[PDB]
RNA sequence: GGCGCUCAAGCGUGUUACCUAUACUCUACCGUCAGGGUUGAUAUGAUGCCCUGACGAGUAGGCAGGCGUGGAGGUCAGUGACGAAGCCUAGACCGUAAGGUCGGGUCGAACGGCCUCUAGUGCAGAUCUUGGUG
RNA sequence: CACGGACCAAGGAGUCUAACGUCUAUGCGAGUGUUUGGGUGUAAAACCCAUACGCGUAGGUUGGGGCCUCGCAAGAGGUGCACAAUCGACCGUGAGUAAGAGCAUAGCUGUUGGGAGUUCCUGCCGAA
């Protein structure tokens, strides 16, 4: 929930000039509409969706992209980068060698993911090898670009790598096997044009009778809100949180005095009256 | 966050995460100090954190805090632990100082079993030199 | 504290089971002819003098009369006979538990022969084993 | 004949005479996640480990004091 | 009926965690209520629109209490003059949450009236006619 | 039932004693169900941990959970001539079990574990037919 | 024990697809569905626009979960969701109105159908 992303230089520098956050990263993160929905399209290389079920999948991924945390769960090497969401100079967008490309990226801390894709590669273990579907690898960054001046290009033969148009991201792309939070380098440009692809607080989606979906629980983390500080004034006293065990065994009272006496107090009299051997009166 | 990331990570693919044959989960996380995928455990799942942690002879004390969750590069900040057990135990419970008793406790036991080995990895490679 | 706890020690529940002095069989009594049916004496006639504070019987053959010396017995490794001596004569305060980790005996031995002499028969009787012969059946068998 | 009656105590379910719950193996990196369990687990090396990886894997678990079920396997029969 | 909400939403997981802690640990009967409505399917939770708001509110001595919808609020162009209320829901429609604001009035998320009303002080729940 | 039995080891009629079951009681254990405790956070996944109780035959019918077999996506910077996959293994360990892991043998070049969606568990018997042998 | 037995190797008793409906999950919400076409496209795809039509819209009182006050509590009340109960008005004697919920997708699944023997292991619920 920053204010602002720090753009950063090829060379590595960080920039000077800073990015508000669009509204997508502030956007539920559901697995499980986007599971359902990854299912429903990867069947068809068919299955009808919704389109705004599709699109709030989209949103979902989008919104996982800038979690670290689940960045590192999927697997990338994203413990080496300057900050999260990456973003990088708009001028990454006109390079026109390969080399130049992966130099910055580089520079940029994404050299552990390419290292583990370009290690990953290995021969396809079912039949499906000599079915077009040989080699398999690992996945790597993905390079978002707002207008393509020859990225394009350079970053095609790289393993791991696959680029992106703004305006045309893809669920598949963004979210491999079903699982949230795919590295992702945003250029300054796409960063700022994400915006438009996908409104604002204040700014209209650009898409047709679209706003951005709404969270059913205001804050995320439920420890902040179950402690808060009026909750703990209304709440009771708590337990133990670990059940004493009462009655363990059950002591019968005709064999043990101290449980006996203790159901009832009478009895230590009765025995010492005799009650029980009292004698009637002979008349 | 740390919720919902928690609960995609449970109930999702913790590309870490081991299970076992008795059906406990293990976290490959070289940060974890418990080696078990639990709501406490996953340096992923919580913002805040500690772990001791050997680099060459030295057994650093690794910190995560919420305010550096950006920026995971400078993420980890390290601390070196005395080579005196005593002060080394002093040293993580003075930076432990009003965190809660988990990673103090898991923290310490990490240590101890690290300064362990240590030693036993000296006995196995004792050499002629001194 | 030299080492920080590996690990936990789980601590034991505190127990209430607390140790209380032996109540004995109605038949042993101080003064008792006794038969024991184990160790190196078994079934040899033996006295009884009197019950240890740690519940082991404190028996003398006398080693005059069988040569069993003053020994510790467990109680339930004998059987107790109804014929009985006066154990008065002898006064068997001094040796004690502690103790056991010759005058002794003879002291003790001079007292209880002064009382074996007065019935007919005794030191035979304490002299001579016991075993079960064939056709003998225990639980019929007056002891 | 099998049934739910037969099921064993939880306590000690999933434990080997030893007292240790197995735990497969395959490389260093899954050997050190067992560090400190090692009164708890104990590891197993993986059928399809080579010759040259079994001594690390055996170097470094002496090392880090945990018991392998099968150690000599592969570097001596039965 | 149900012990949970069948849905695998983890939003709605987490409200379903908050609110069965609190009627846990509250003496009040609102988070009870409030946990078990949770728990409900979409046939078992009819749409609660605008136009119900305004006559909760009508009634007597209602006019400043928090209405409570355990569901989906809807616009309902039939009214002009709606009262400011700051209704909480589970979800509301664009409709219903522009009419709510342009009256002054405001939407918040059961969590939010869960940090105002802790015992549900003051609330007025509603529940949408399942007809069919 | 068999061997055997005939003042019975054959009957009916009464008496006790004695043997013992998926029956009943108590305890421990394993499962299903139900009621609960537990966050200014737990010394292990609030789908966790813990406490308490009830039940376990069940025909007709119906529901769930596991084991195994392939397909695809993702993942383990997985495994491999210091021997991968396949097959066998009256060997060891684990699971109530379907089975799983390891060891050994065999094998001799690549394949497996794990999250998801998608296909998909072993036998019986008949008409006979064909080859081959009388 | 009572009842039957040329011999070895095999092979070994029919197919895709439709209509209506209950329940569950998700998206939107008096709306909802796009794809009937086009653009775009590291190119069946993915991303986006219209273009239409489909199915939707066009009060009295009592009880009542809940919330407020008083009360330590039982209660005293006050207020009243859904819905019911009867009491009626109006529209046109009910499906009534007097403050609507549906559409779409997916899963499971009942019935009708178009040619149309046993059943991996464990557990659970259970007529007659
Ligand atoms: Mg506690
Ligand atoms: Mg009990
Ligand atoms: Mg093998
Ligand atoms: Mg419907
Ligand atoms: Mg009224
Ligand atoms: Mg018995
Ligand atoms: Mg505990
Ligand atoms: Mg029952
Ligand atoms: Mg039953
Ligand atoms: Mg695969
Ligand atoms: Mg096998
Ligand atoms: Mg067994
Ligand atoms: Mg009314
Ligand atoms: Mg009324
Ligand atoms: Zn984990």
Not at chain 2, 21 to 36: A, D, I, K, W
Not at chain 5, 106 to 127: F, H, S, W
């Amino acid at each position: 929930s920053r204010p602002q992303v720090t753009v950063h230089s090829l060379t590595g520098e960080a920039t000077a000039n800073a990015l508000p956050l669009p509204a997508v990263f502030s956007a539920p993160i559901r697995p499980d509409i986007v599971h359902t929905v990854f299912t429903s399209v990867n069947k068809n290389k068919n299955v009808k969706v919704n389109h705004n079920e599709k699109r709030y999948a989209t949103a979902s991924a989008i919104a996982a992209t800038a979690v670290a945390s689940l960045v590192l769960a999927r697997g990338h090497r994203v413990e080496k980068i300057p900050e999260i969401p990456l973003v990088v100079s708009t001028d990454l967008e006109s390079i026109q060698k390969t080399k130049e490309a992966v130099a910055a990226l580089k520079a940029v801390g994404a050299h552990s993911d390419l290292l583990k894709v370009l290690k990953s590669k290995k021969l396809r273990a079912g039949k499906g090898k000599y079915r077009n579907r040989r080699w398999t690898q690992r996945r790597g960054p993905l390079v978002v670009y707002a207008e393509d001046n020859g990225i394009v290009k350079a970053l095609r033969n790289v393993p791991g790598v696959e680029t992106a148009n703004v305006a045309s991201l893809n669920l598949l792309q963004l979210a491999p096997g079903a699982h949230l939070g795919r590295f992702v380098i945003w250029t300054e440009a796409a960063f700022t044009k994400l915006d438009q692809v996908w409104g604002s607080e204040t700014v209209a989606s650009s898409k047709v009778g679209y706003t951005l979906p709404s969270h059913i629980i205001s804050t995320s983390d439920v420890t902040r809100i179950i402690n808060s500080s009026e909750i703990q004034s209304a709440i009771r006293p708590a337990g133990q949180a670990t059940q004493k065990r009462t009655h363990v065994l059950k002591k019968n009272p005709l064999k043990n005095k101290q449980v006996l006496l203790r159901l009832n107090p009478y009895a230590k009299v009765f025995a010492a009256e005799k009650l029980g051997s009292k004698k009637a009166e002979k008349t | 966050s740390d919720e919902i990331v928690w609960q995609v990570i449970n109930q999702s693919f913790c590309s870490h995460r081991i299970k076992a044959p008795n059906g406990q989960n293990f976290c490959r996380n070289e940060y974890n100090v418990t080696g078990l995928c639990t709501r406490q455990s996953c340096p992923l799942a919580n913002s805040k954190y500690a772990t001791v942690k050997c680099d060459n002879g030295k057994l650093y004390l690794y910190m995560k805090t919420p305010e550096r969750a950006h920026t995971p590069a400078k993420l980890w900040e390290r601390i070196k632990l005395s080579k005196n057990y005593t002060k080394a135990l002093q040293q993580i419970d003075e930076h432990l100082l009003h965190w809660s008793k988990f990673f103090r406790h898991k923290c310490k036991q990490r240590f101890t079993k690290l300064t362990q080995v240590m030693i036993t990895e000296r006995r196995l490679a004792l050499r002629e030199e001194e | 504290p030299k080492w920080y706890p590996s690990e936990d020690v789980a601590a034991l529940k505190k127990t209430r089971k607390a140790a209380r002095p032996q109540k004995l069989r109605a038949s042993l009594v101080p003064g008792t002819v006794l038969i024991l049916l184990a160790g190196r004496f078994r079934g040899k006639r033996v006295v009884y003098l009197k019950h240890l504070e740690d519940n082991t019987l404190l028996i003398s053959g006398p080693f005059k009369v069988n040569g069993v010396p003053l020994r510790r017995v467990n109680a339930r490794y004998v059987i107790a006979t109804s014929t009985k001596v006066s154990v008065e004569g002898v006064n068997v305060e001094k040796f004690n538990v502690e103790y056991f980790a010759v005058e002794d005996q003879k002291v003790v031995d001079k007292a209880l022969i002064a009382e074996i002499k007065k019935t007919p028969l005794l030191k035979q009787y304490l002299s001579a084993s016991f075993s079960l012969k064939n056709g003998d059946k225990p639980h019929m068998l007056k002891f | 004949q099998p049934k739910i009656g037969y099921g064993s105590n939880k306590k000690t379910k999933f434990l080997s005479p030893s007292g240790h719950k197995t735990f497969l193996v395959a490389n260093v990196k899954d050997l050190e996640t067992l560090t400190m369990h090692t009164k708890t687990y104990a590891a197993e090396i993986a059928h399809n480990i080579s010759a040259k990886n079994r001594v690390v894997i055996l170097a470094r678990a002496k090392a880090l004091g945990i018991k392998v079920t099968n150690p000599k396997g592969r570097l001596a029969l039965e | 009926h149900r012990t949970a909400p069948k849905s695998d939403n983890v939003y709605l997981k987490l409200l379903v965690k908050l609110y069965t802690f609190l009627a846990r640990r509250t003496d009040a009967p609102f988070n009870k209520v409030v946990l078990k409505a949770l728990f409900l399917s979409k046939i078992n939770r009819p749409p609660v629109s605008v136009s119900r708001i305004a006559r909760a509110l009508k009634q007597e001595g209602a006019a400043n209490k928090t209405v409570v919808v355990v569901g989906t609020v809807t616009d309902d162009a039939r009214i002009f003059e709606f009262p400011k209320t700051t209704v909480a829901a589970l979800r509301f429609t664009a409709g219903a949450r522009a009419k709510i604001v342009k009256a002054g009035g405001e939407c918040i998320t059961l969590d939010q009236l869960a940090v105002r009303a802790p015992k549900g002080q003051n609330t007025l729940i509603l529940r949408g006619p399942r007809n069919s």
